[PDB]
């Protein structure tokens, strides 16, 4: 593109949303050095994202957007409170800062790239006579679930709303219970997050193009519907293969430690950038761990003994590891690791498909439920813990099953062939490289 183009990038501050988006942006900015990229997110998220050294692509500048929290505000109860406050004032807070970036660069916005959550991107793009390109950072099946929100509700009564009778929502997908769906589709339909997702489903067809961090082999039938709902659908993932972003950090020699172990023998544990199993769960896992023998790596959450038992800490310090932050993508590509105990967030899922490792899923929130059903029943590269909770009986059951002598192997096989499609999809010749090239064209023109 030319030196007159200005791309505004609006990222979601919570969960693993902002980093994947920034990654996509970095790939584009490298290909288009004369194009200006303005990245908007909360001060706290920007601080974490832009602390990186020479990662300073010159044509990318970040701008802090108000987090919606009132003056003096203090934690309070539920961790949902700051998310709800952000959502409630995000449109005007984004606009205020976008306005500063336009006055400062002297360049009107030509393209608005946003997390798909930002349904208001169409309206904003409209006002500035700019293009709108939202990015759904999760899977195709959940995106389509949101596009189908009204349809689902219209075919949902007292039975289904209460898990008595299952709903047939997605093509080429098992029948689901309301508890399977992301909060908001059929429950708590009124809260800000739920309203944000519904509006997104309704506004997406107005976009110039809808990008998604996924690849065409993930779900053919779902993709076809999405393809018919939007002006353009672009599969630009998996991001771990299509975009840069370093992070090859092993402050705790996990990979070396992994070297000094054999194949499919280590248990990697990670429940995302925000989750930490409840008390009865952690304690059920920690013990499940040092009773199964299985060597392991566990990404806790900074806090060590804080939640974990003292003794346990220095008793397993010989057959397993526990870190605050691990080099997950690399760990998942290591031949040592045999199973991935995850909450099935989408990013971790794409990373596991690329690494070729079987999965143990204990979903918590959002799309994790649909993701578990997708990898357990449709891709068959994983299984979920019993009851969706972590109890010593449910854990061992899963470990034993995946680390078994049959099922675990097959899953590993199924995910190796999927891994193959992933690598193929990103060759210049594949659909992901091609949709990415198109994305670049739209964003930089
Ligand atoms: O020790 C860790 C734990 C997590 N992650 C990364 O954190 C992200 C988790 O995203 P996901 O969508 O799986 O779950 P979320 O954070 O949205 O709940 C993934 O990129 C993981 O690789 C990591 O790099 N090291």
């Amino acid at each position: 593109g030319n030196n007159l183009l200005h791309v505004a990038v609006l990222a979601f501050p919570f969960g693993t949303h902002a980093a994947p988006l920034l990654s996509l942006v970095k790939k584009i900015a490298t290909e288009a050095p004369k194009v200006t990229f303005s990245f908007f997110c909360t001060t706290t998220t920007n601080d974490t994202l832009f602390s990186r050294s020479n990662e300073f692509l010159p044509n990318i500048k970040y701008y802090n957007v108000h987090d919606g929290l009132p003056k003096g505000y203090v934690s309070s109860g539920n961790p949902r409170e700051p998310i709800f406050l952000f959502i409630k004032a995000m449109q005007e807070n984004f606009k205020h800062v976008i306005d500063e970036a336009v006055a400062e660069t002297g360049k009107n916005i030509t393209c608005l790239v946003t997390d798909a959550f930002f349904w208001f991107g169409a309206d904003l793009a409209e006002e500035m006579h700019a293009k709108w390109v939202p990015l759904w950072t999760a899977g195709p099946h959940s995106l389509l679930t949101h596009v189908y929100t009204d349809l689902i509700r219209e075919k949902t009564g007292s039975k289904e709303v209460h898990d008595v009778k299952s709903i047939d929502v997605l093509p080429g997908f098992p029948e689901l219970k309301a508890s399977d769906l992301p909060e908001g589709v059929i429950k708590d339909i009124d809260v800000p997050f739920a309203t944000m997702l519904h509006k997104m489903g309704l506004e997406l067809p107005r976009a110039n193009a809808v990008a998604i961090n996924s690849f065409a082999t993930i779900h053919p039938l779902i993709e076809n519907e999405l393809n018919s709902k939007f002006k353009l659908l672009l599969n630009v993932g998996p991001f771990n293969l299509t975009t840069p972003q370093r992070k090859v950090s092993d402050e705790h020699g996990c990979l070396e430690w992994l070297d000094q172990h054999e194949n499919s023998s280590v248990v990697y544990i990670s429940f995302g950038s925000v989750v930490t199993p409840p008390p009865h769960e952690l304690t059920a896992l920690a013990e499940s761990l040092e009773e199964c023998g299985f060597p392991f790596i566990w990404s806790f959450r900074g806090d060590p003994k804080e939640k974990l038992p003292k003794g346990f800490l220095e008793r397993t310090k010989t057959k397993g590891k526990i870190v605050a932050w691990a080099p997950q993508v690399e760990i998942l590509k290591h031949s040592s690791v045999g199973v991935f105990l995850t909450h099935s967030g989408w990013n971790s899922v794409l990373e596991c498909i690329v690494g070729g490792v079987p999965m143990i899923s204990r979903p918590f929130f959002g799309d994790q439920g649909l993701n578990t059903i997708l990898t357990e029943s449709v891709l068959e590269i994983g299984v979920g813990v019993d009851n969706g909770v972590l109890t010593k009986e449910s854990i061992k059951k899963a470990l034993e099953l995946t680390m078994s002598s049959e099922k675990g192997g097959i899953m590993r096989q199924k995910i190796v062939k999927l891994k193959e499609s992933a690598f193929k999809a990103v060759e210049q010749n594949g659909t992901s490289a091609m949709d990415f090239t198109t994305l670049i064209q739209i964003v930089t023109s």
Side-chain angles (χ1 to χ4, degrees), residues 1 4-445:
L4 196 32
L5 300 173
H6 184 181
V7 176
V9 189
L10 316 183
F12 192 67
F14 312 110
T16 306
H17 276 259
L21 180 50
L22 171 51
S23 280
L24 185 169
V25 165
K26 281 185 184 283
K27 171 99 172 194
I28 298 180
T30 68
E31 293 295 317
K34 300 200 303 180
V35 176
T36 302
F37 292 85
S38 295
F39 189 87
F40 306 89
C41 205
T42 56
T43 309
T44 303
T45 298
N46 285 331
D47 287 347
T48 302
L49 288 185
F50 296 89
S51 292
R52 310 171 103 295
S53 295
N54 190 59
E55 196 60 358
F56 278 47
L57 286 183
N59 60 337
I60 294 172
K61 178 177 172 175
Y62 66 87
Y63 294 80
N64 299 318
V65 62
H66 195 97
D67 62 11
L69 299 172
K71 187 187 174 180
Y73 170 98
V74 191
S75 181
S76 300
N78 56 309
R80 287 288 184 182
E81 185 176 55
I83 303 192
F84 278 167
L85 289 166
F86 175 74
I87 287 171
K88 288 169 177 163
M90 68 183 157
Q91 193 176 167
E92 281 322 88
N93 291 343
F94 268 117
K95 184 49 182 173
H96 201 266
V97 56
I98 284 161
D99 279 0
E100 291 181 12
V102 170
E104 300 184 19
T105 58
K107 300 171 189 180
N108 287 306
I109 298 302
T110 53
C111 186
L112 191 73
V113 181
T114 72
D115 186 293
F117 284 3
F118 299 147
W119 58 270
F120 62 82
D123 299 323
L124 220 51
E126 177 179 7
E127 275 155 44
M128 313 180 285
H129 306 262
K131 308 167 169 181
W132 179 36
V133 179
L135 180 291
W136 174 251
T137 67
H141 58 299
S142 54
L143 210 206
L144 186 275
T145 289
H146 293 295
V147 170
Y148 282 0
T149 300
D150 294 314
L151 218 58
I152 291 166
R153 289 175 191 180
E154 276 175 51
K155 68 211 299 289
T156 299
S158 293
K159 304 180 303 184
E160 31 285 341
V161 174
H162 295 287
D163 297 52
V164 176
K165 206 155 192 176
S166 292
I167 310 174
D168 165 57
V169 43
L170 312 173
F173 209 85
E175 199 147 305
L176 324 166
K177 293 68 65 189
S179 51
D180 288 342
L181 305 170
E183 165 189 49
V185 187
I186 292 299
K187 283 67 185 302
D188 304 296
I189 72 165
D190 47 277
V191 294
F193 206 104
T195 275
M196 179 184 67
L197 288 161
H198 187 189
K199 285 190 272 205
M200 171 197 72
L202 302 177
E203 314 282 332
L204 288 174
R206 303 171 63 186
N208 292 248
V210 180
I212 178 173
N213 183 9
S214 177
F215 61 101
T217 334
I218 286 293
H219 202 121
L221 304 187
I222 296 308
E223 285 151 31
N224 298 318
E225 313 277 53
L226 286 175
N227 203 64
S228 68
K229 300 308 167 177
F230 311 146
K231 300 184 184 171
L232 228 202
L233 175 61
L234 305 168
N235 274 289
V236 290
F239 277 175
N240 33 136
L241 286 186
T242 68
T243 65
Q245 215 74 305
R246 271 48 290 196
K247 300 185 64 180
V248 188
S249 168
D250 206 348
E251 187 180 68
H252 310 286
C254 297
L255 312 181
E256 278 64 11
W257 190 70
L258 274 168
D259 284 315
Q260 58 198 65
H261 285 73
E262 62 229 83
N263 291 47
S264 320
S265 52
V266 183
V267 173
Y268 179 56
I269 307 162
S270 190
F271 292 111
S273 68
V274 303
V275 177
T276 45
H280 279 54
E281 307 209 1
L282 294 182
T283 58
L285 176 74
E287 299 181 359
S288 292
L289 291 178
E290 65 165 300
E291 273 170 48
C292 294
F294 283 135
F296 60 73
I297 324 173
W298 178 359
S299 183
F300 196 81
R301 209 71 298 134
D303 290 306
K305 57 182 63 179
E306 317 294 301
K307 276 61 179 176
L308 281 174
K310 199 86 61 173
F312 166 66
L313 299 172
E314 289 53 71
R315 168 159 61 275
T316 52
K317 190 192 297 175
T318 299
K319 202 56 185 175
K321 292 184 60 59
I322 299 178
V323 299
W325 198 241
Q328 184 174 302
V329 34
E330 292 58 58
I331 286 165
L332 283 165
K333 290 176 175 183
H334 202 305
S335 64
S336 285
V337 185
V339 76
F340 181 18
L341 174 60
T342 182
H343 74 315
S344 277
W346 193 246
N347 300 101
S348 289
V349 171
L350 292 173
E351 293 166 8
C352 181
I353 290 177
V354 168
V357 190
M359 288 174 274
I360 289 178
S361 181
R362 186 286 187 219
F364 278 93
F365 61 83
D367 64 326
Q368 290 154 32
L370 286 58
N371 289 346
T372 295
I373 297 176
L374 189 263
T375 59
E376 167 169 292
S377 318
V378 177
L379 295 182
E380 308 176 297
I381 64 178
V383 276
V385 166
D386 303 80
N387 309 303
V389 293
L390 293 185
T391 53
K392 284 213 298 175
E393 168 172 37
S394 67
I395 294 184
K396 295 181 182 178
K397 174 175 181 178
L399 289 174
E400 190 175 302
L401 186 64
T402 50
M403 309 298 231
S404 293
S405 308
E406 184 65 347
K407 178 48 59 183
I410 314 164
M411 308 184 304
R412 180 179 290 287
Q413 181 192 66
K414 230 67 182 176
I415 199 169
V416 155
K417 303 204 179 306
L418 186 52
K419 175 184 169 179
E420 272 177 32
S421 284
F423 274 98
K424 169 169 151 41
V426 304
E427 298 183 324
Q428 192 176 186
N429 232 0
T431 294
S432 291
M434 292 182 77
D435 281 355
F436 209 120
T437 298
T438 301
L439 174 65
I440 289 166
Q441 284 187 303
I442 298 182
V443 175
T444 68
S445 70

